[PDB]
Amino acid sequence: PIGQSLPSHSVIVPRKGVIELMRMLDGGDNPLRVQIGSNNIRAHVGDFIFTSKLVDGRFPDYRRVLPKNPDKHLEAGCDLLKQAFARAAILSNEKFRGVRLYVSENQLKITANNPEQEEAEEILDVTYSGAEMEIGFNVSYVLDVLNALKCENVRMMLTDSVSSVQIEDAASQSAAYVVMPMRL
Amino acid sequence: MIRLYPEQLRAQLNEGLRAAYLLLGNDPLLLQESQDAVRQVAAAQGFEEHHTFSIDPNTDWNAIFSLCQAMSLFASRQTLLLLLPENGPNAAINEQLLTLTGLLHDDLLLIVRGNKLSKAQENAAWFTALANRSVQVTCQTPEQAQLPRWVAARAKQLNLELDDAANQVLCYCYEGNLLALAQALERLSLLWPDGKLTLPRVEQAVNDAAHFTPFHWVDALLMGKSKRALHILQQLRLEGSEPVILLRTLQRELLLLVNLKRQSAHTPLRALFDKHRVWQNRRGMMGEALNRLSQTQLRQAVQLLTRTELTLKQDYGQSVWAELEGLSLLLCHKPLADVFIDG
Amino acid sequence: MRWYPWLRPDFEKLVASYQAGRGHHALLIQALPGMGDDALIYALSRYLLCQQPQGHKSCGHCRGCQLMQAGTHPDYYTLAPEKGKNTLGVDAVREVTEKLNEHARLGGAKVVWVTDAALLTDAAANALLKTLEEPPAETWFFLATREPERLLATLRSRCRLHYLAPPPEQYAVTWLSREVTMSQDALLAALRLSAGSPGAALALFQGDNWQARETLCQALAYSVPSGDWYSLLAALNHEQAPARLHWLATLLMDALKRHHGAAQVTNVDVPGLVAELANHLSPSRLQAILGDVCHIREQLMSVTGINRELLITDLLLRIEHYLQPGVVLPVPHL
Amino acid sequence: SYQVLARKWRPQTFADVVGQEHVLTALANGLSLGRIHHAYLFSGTRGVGKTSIARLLAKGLNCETGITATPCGVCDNCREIEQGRFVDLIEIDAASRTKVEDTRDLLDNVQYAPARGRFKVYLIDEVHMLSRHSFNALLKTLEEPPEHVKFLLATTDPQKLPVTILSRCLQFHLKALDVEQIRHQLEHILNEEHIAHEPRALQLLARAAEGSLRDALSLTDQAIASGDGQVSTQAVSAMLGTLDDDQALSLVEAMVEANGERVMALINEAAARGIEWEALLVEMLGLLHRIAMVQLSPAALGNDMAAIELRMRELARTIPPTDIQLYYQTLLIGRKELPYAPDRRMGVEMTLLRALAFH
Amino acid sequence: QVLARKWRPQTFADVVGQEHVLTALANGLSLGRIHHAYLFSGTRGVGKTSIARLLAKGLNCETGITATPCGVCDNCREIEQGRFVDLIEIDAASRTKVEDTRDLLDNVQYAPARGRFKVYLIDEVHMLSRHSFNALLKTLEEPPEHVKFLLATTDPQKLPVTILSRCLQFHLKALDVEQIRHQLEHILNEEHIAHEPRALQLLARAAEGSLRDALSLTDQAIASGDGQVSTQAVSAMLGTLDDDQALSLVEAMVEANGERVMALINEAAARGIEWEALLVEMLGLLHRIAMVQLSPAALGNDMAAIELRMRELARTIPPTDIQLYYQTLLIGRKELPYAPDRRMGVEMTLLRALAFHPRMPLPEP
Amino acid sequence: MSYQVLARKWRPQTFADVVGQEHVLTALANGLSLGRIHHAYLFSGTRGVGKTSIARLLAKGLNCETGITATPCGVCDNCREIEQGRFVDLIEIDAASRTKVEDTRDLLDNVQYAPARGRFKVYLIDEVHMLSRHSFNALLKTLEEPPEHVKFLLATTDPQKLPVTILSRCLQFHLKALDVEQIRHQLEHILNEEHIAHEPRALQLLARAAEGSLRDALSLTDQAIASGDGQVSTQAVSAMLGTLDDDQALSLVEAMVEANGERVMALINEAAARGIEWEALLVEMLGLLHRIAMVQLSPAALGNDMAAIELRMRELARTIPPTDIQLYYQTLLIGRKELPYAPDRRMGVEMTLLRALAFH
């Protein structure tokens, strides 16, 4: 939410940078301050001065990617889920880690099978109204965000049906995250 | 650097610790023989730590200890077989070769088997500081000529009589193939109870671990024996021979025949058969073919030879087997003449 | 090679054009890379990468230029062939290319120039199609060939060709002459023999090639009457056999020219010899023969496992066969 | 750098692309109907319209007006299609890639279904490059791929491309483009361009575009680049090395004159300018063809050697058919064999030599 | 759509020709002369496979072992449905590994779980690595008395001789335009889809004995169109005319025509149709004529009635002429590349034949 | 049901078992029985020599339970063990995964281990030529200074991929091709003893048909048998030989030379009927002509392996003068370039052949 309205600039930082920056935050350092320049930006954190030339070119869209009607609210605990999810993947598809979900309403249900025999099953809870979300996605992606999600009530806004599910912190909206289903 | 002939390897081996006993030569029988003699006497000489480690064309190098006082968990000198690159040690190699020369080569008693080095390698510093301590053992093969001699001494390796009548026939037919000839004498010795060579006996069973050279055919051709040469080839087939070889070798002789035919039709036969080459025995066959083979009729033949060569070699037509039947008679022109459409 | 003066005007247009973005960022310079294209190319990058600054300069100054001079210009690439090959592989390509999707990395435009695009590979080339066609930002691509023939068409669909013939023979000779002593006939004989390309013309006088040219020339004059060609095996038997094979051809051809009445020769480095060919040989067979000289020249290059010699020899005999009657005398076709 | 036209000349509708109606129609037609294959094979010359028919189709599938004969211009999906980014659509150059590796990965992502698209449409071009394995791997999903997924194959050549692949595509063979189809389209194009076109050059280019609209278009960009503005004849005739001269017949004649020198000295200078041999060759050949034709009928020709028609005629009749065939033949073989010569200049000399030796 | 796939065979019914191979299969299925190994080689039109599923389904049912043209029980049905257990289909994709072969070797050990025999089935084997070939020498050499390996190798050439010495070879061969034509009609009658025998012929002709391919072509006709299989769509998207055109011209050349020939020259140039198609077309006919010279035999399937033009031509045209021309033509073909143009080239080669006509060449002065 | 499967035995499973390949078998036992055995050896030779069948016999006499005998020992179960892997002292250690340097290191940590049954460690390493350069440093270690107990028994069918050092290092025995009679006889008695019906001629056919390999002989019997209802029937073997073979050029050569009209076409049609490449068929014809043309410039032309067909080649040759041979040859050669622009090579060929007619 914070920031300024103060101009954004093509500040497309790489992959690496963001890491050190991220590093330059933690509570620690000074607060992170930015001169967002297209040019470069000039970041202030630690005894450093971290500065990129920026790759200048667009950064692909990010509003569309939100599910089509992410709306069923799958208020779960990010953690529990993150656990359950972790377990389920094992005898889920072992390739893409594409767990398939059939979140029983208000509960949850998950049915995973690793093609290669086996199957994993969970029963968890998600305050989820609206009929089974019946969407599977790459659990490999997911957990990542659960965990980058410091928020532990994460409401998912899905459109129940093998379509994108937005997950956001339920608790704020900061972290809003979208992954996409697997196969059709 | 001292060149030694394998049979005299003991001279330098024994007398003193030669650093790099460099068995450059190529007769495998000779190389093998020069290798094991150093080793044997090396292993005996407290260098039992004996390892083989090639020197790739690759920079290679590994055990470059040559003194460091690292051991006393397993102290001793060791010895290091280097199989050389194609032409010998290259850079990196040369380098780390020149290092060893520089040091006690302690624990790295050099045994460099290989081949003849390249010149620049031999002028390359490493091959400069080995000198005077190393031993080059020429492991190069007999001429046709020295071949019987050798062969004859070599008989007594097997102690069996051998027959020099046979020796020759071995020297020709195994002209230049010491190793297999050595094994030749072995298979048959076993095969009989007696295992005594002599020519009659070596006819009855012939070592099927030792080749019947192109010569038989081509020479048969020299003569003009346009059937003889042909038969040897029926055999050269069942035998599976790569045609390349036959071509190669045939090419060798025939181009030699051209050139000698240019100068021969006015220069006594066979002198030139050895003023160049053309074995002794061939020389006759060969002095003939110049007279038989008049350089002109000879031209079209080359044109077919080339033809086949290309058929093979660019085209990988494996019908060169049939192309030759033409050529035999195209070249020979029969034992007489009988030159015909090319193929 | 080196930058020669005759690379400049090409450059200017191109940079002009480039600067005007009329000049397409692509570019193809026919001219031998032997007749200067490389330096010309790189002269361009020199500028182009530093963003094209000044109207047209090779850039002596510029950070781009100098960092490109240091080469450390990341923008900068030299993009030679791959060395695990010797042709400019796909991979080589894949890289530099993809680095340009990260924009400029130290500014100025990039210039990513192939040294001799003549030297590209196919996975490389195929790879390069889309990049040479499609313009990435600040990219000025610069390619070099012996001749345009050094490249594929689909590529050239998009090559903004900036032709560049050899400079004229005269100049190509004067240019050639400066640097190799031996008569302008040898310069020219050679130059001419080079399809008039200098860069190409020059090489001849190096080595014992042009001396062997002569050498060869001599043995042959003996060969020809004598019907011993076989003498020539060596004169032409060489790593430059094809070249020596080439030395020879241009004379055979000169003899057929005499066979069409034609003073004109491409080896003006001796006309006597030329005459005698025609002289001892009917054109039919001269002509037949001329074919084959190259053909061997080809074969020496084409046949796997081919005895250079074997081939050099067969030929002599066979010539020798032709000089001879009855021995049917071709003319080349079917 | 600096922009091209070729692309910029790529369709939005069937018209932008000249020809292949069988395909245009085949396309308009497919599209409109449920005759949407998730396997298409556009096989035509590089941007003849192998790539153009693909574009139309794309917009039409991811026409946000469904599947439509024409791609219903604008649709977001349609207009972004020819712009960067467009999730439904994922396009590919299998050129840079040769690896199978590249081929494997590709099959995996079809799963992820857009969070808003309507056919995850796949466009492979330059597939030929890819290795065998790369090829064979595609058969699997050409047959039954997951839904939305498509396989618009465009190929220059479906030849480095197995039977089974073709067996498993709609192959809309885009046939080639008539010089005129080209000239025209160009003529149309260039003129739209501010810079004065240049007919001569238009033709110079029309024939020169090599049946591919893309190049055609390319040429042009390039002609401007080095003509620094404006298409003019000369810059293009020269640019093209093209001899708008009758030197073809000149030499033919001088061969016939038994004239050695004239024929030869002329080529050599031409070689200092490196002048195109072929151009020169094709022409000679043609004349001969016609002349003989002029023998057949000095009318039933569909000859365009009219300026010299009389010359043709003249030749045609005076020289027996036979010999005409024969001239024609000699040089045809020499042309064949021209390149073979290590100066280029050398190969043509041979051709003519042999002609000149024929007379 | 994939009518190529869809229409594939599955019963003995769906196997055209190779009745000998069916008869044999039926037969060897009756008296136990079944050997472990079978080896189907042949075209991708009949499918190497189809005939295998038929064998398979004939090797095990759930009604014992009897030859069966069609599914029964499950086993057979399955088998053909690509559902049977002992089925174990052997193919390739990006797959070209050893590991694949291994498994097969392993089930040999096993006795059929549902089958009366284990019923493995390869398609074509030639994409796999060197190893897997040899791996089979072993198991093949000595196989269980309850595991059947039904090999298929389009070419038995791929397969080693020791195992091949042992194999019951069956070869599938190519299918006629007529049979194909006969077919496509039938199939297009099942999925009633318009066609015209000429379009069918044009198609049936273009297919390359691969019904599967004949079906690929029919597919892009239907799509080039909107489901039609008219001659234009077909002839255009195919780039091919009809023999008559040529024939009419040929009748023109023989007859030395220069205008007629010029005409049909242009006729061709006008249909946005190919120049050597013609050349080709012409050499074929020459030959046919010439065939018809010797026996009242050998005439086309794109002529059901221009037989007479042929008979005729065979009769009236001295053999000599027929060779000259076929020849003049053939050279056209080869040289056509260096031609300054295919049409000219085409034009010029006919000028040649005629300039050289063994009737008379062009006006010769 | 594969019925009988004889392509597993009747390669040398005993020192005497197979009556072809004696060249090796004889010196093998004189060496072995006697103590004059080497540390290391080499086997080679074409398949069906029982390539391996030899190495295994060597280990048995080392490891027999009748000492070091080359004497058969069947009551010696060592001996039986040895013929299988079962013998501890026989290691059938292969070579197809012993090709990295580490694969071989291990085998040498086991050259510190004595014959636990036999009297030689016999490491039977077969088909060797697959090893990396590094692997080849390390095997030589136990040769150069040799550990006797281990015997390394090497089989290959490519002795070239093993360095001169190693070769010089090893004693090589070379196994040859089996001849018509070798095979025939081996079978004749073996099947005579195996209670198997051998219609003699089937042998000679099969014997003739494949010479070089004993193994082959039995694989072919296996099909012959399946087709012969358990029997090596001449019917079976001719049948089998027909499956795998068709000659359409000899017949064609005859028909085209005779100027038979429709036999040529008939044949061309048959040649299409049971397909044959038209190009290959051209070439198949070409070669026949040459063969006759050579039978006329040398009976030697027909090599000894050609005895089988000499009679007809001879006779074709002699019914035809060679000029006409080179005339048709000329025609064929030309035909051969027609196939490509030939609208069909069958036609191309038929067209070609209809030209041969005119020269009869």
Author numbering:
A (entry chain G): 183 to 366
B (entry chain A): 1 to 343
C (entry chain E): 1 to 334
D (entry chain D): 2 to 360
E (entry chain C): 4 to 368
F (entry chain B): 1 to 360
Show passages lifted from the paper.
Clamp loaders are pentameric ATPases that place circular sliding clamps onto DNA, where they function in DNA replication and genome integrity. Because the sliding clamp is a closed ring in solution, it needs to be opened and placed onto DNA by a separate ATPase complex called the clamp loader. All clamp loaders are pentameric ATPases of the AAA + family (ATPases associated with various cellular activities). Here we describe a series of structures of the E. coli clamp loader in the process of placing the clamp onto a p/t-junction.
In the presence of ATPγS, we obtained an ∼8 Å resolution reconstruction of the clamp loader bound to a closed clamp. Despite the modest resolution of the reconstruction, we can unambiguously identify the location and orientation of all the protein domains of both the clamp loader and sliding clamp. We observe that the γ-complex contacts the sliding clamp primarily through the A, D, and E subunits; the B and C subunits make minimal contact with the surface of the clamp. Furthermore, the AAA+ modules of the B and C subunits make minimal contact with each other. As inter-subunit contacts are necessary to hydrolyze ATP, this separation between subunits likely inhibits ATPase activity. Because the clamp is closed in this state, we attribute this conformation as the initial-binding complex. The Initial-Binding state contains ATPγS, all other states contain ADP·BeFx. Despite the low resolution of the structure, we unambiguously observe that the γ-complex initially binds to a closed ß-clamp. The existence of a closed binding complex was predicted based on rapid kinetics studies which showed that clamp binding occurs before clamp opening. The γ-complex binds the ß-clamp using the A, D, and E subunits, and with the A-gate of the γ-complex open.
